Design a protein around this nucleic acid. Structure first.
Ligand SMILES: [Zn+2]
Length: 253
DNA sequence: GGTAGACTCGGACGC
DNA sequence: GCGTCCGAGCTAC
């Protein structure tokens, strides 16, 4: 999922688990557990803790417990559901947190690409995978000034810049392509080549792109060969920053 | 230490 | 039977 869908998972999952106490943690694919590296230590430390909250940083979910935080990344196929311990698990269920009320938080992931890290809450933000993560795109911490500073200092492409998770949290191939289209900026443009006006432009469209999706329709992503929705020019697809990049050669400069 | 590119997690899938 | 592919987020010069 992208940032907006992760926010939806966060918002909807929370009431379904808040105040529940973990009685057991069952792990069927230990490779998903990245910290502690020993999945048995992972399971043992969580037993007895109560879920107190659920936050999101970038595309990471942060489950807040009594002492620990559980940092979870769904990657492509990761999904959480809450269900009764009396019912058969669904396929590709790799981790299950059993609560004292007979309900379970189940983690499914056909790809097995998702990750889980557990640390004392006060440490989570300075350890992998959260350490270094850039500001939230919808927060005042992410500002034109911040973007300009990273842009001027680098030599790489504007697309590469926006894909950098230290620059801003949760911008993937898709939202980068769309934001650049709406700001009228070619993705292969050197970040340093952008004018102040262009920076403000890009920042404003990045926020609008993420923001509209979080609250509530693509221009370029995947649409190569189709007419641009603003000028009718065929959308193109190339490689920029070792990525498949979608753009309109007329709207974007 | 900036940064391009490799790397990684499985397993699907088409030759 | 082996390369090619998903793509978000360690390593060499
Ligand atoms: Zn156009």
């Amino acid at each position: 999922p992208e940032l907006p869908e992760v926010e939806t998972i966060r918002r909807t999952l929370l009431p379904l688990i808040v105040g529940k106490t973990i009685e057991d943690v069952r792990i069927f694919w230990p490779n998903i557990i990245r910290h502690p590296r020993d999945s048995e230590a992972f399971a043992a430390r969580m037993i007895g803790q109560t879920v107190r909250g659920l936050e999101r940083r970038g595309k990471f979910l942060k489950f807040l417990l009594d002492r620990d935080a559980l940092i979870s990344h769904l990657r492509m196929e990761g999904r959480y559901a809450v269900a009764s311990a009396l019912e058969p698990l669904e396929p590709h269920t790799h981790v299950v947190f059993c609560f004292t009320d007979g309900s379970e938080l189940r983690y499914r992931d056909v790809a097995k690409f998702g990750t889980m890290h557990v640390y004392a809450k006060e440490e989570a933000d300075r350890r992998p995978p959260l350490a270094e993560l850039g500001p939230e795109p919808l927060s005042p911490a992410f500002s034109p000034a911040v973007l300009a500073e990273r842009a001027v200092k680098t030599k790489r492409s504007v697309k590469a810049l926006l894909l950098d998770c230290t620059v801003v949290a949760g911008f993937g191939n898709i939202y980068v392509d769309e934001s650049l289209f709406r700001a009228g900026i070619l993705p292969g443009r050197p970040a340093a080549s952008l004018s102040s006006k262009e920076i403000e432009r890009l920042h404003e469209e990045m926020v609008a792109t993420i923001g509209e999706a979080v609250m509530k329709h693509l221009y370029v992503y995947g649409r190569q060969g189709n007419p641009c929705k603003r000028c009718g020019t065929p959308i193109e697809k190339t490689v920029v920053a070792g990525r498949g990049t979608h753009y309109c050669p007329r709207c974007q400069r």
